[PDB]
Amino acid sequence: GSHMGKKTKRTADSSSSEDEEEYVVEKVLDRRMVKGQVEYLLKWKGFSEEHNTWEPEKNLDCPELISEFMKKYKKMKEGENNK
DSSP: OOOSOOOOOOOOOOOOOOOOOOOOBOOOOOEEEETTEEEEEEOBTTOOGGGOEEEETTTOOOHHHHHHHHHHHHHHSSOSSOO
């Protein structure tokens, strides 16, 4: 048992990493209208609640979102039959 020159050979190769950032809407939190213009509260991936941002409906590239949201708001707001 003597250590003269230990020769070890191994290959793993692990090159999988990249730093990138993208903007993706999460869901419709609130909605407001001003000067005959509709707007919605968008939330980009990473932006905290306090970092919420408002955008025009014409920009809202997600109609389905609004449709669903209306479903929740309907229940929230008191008024099913009586307008």
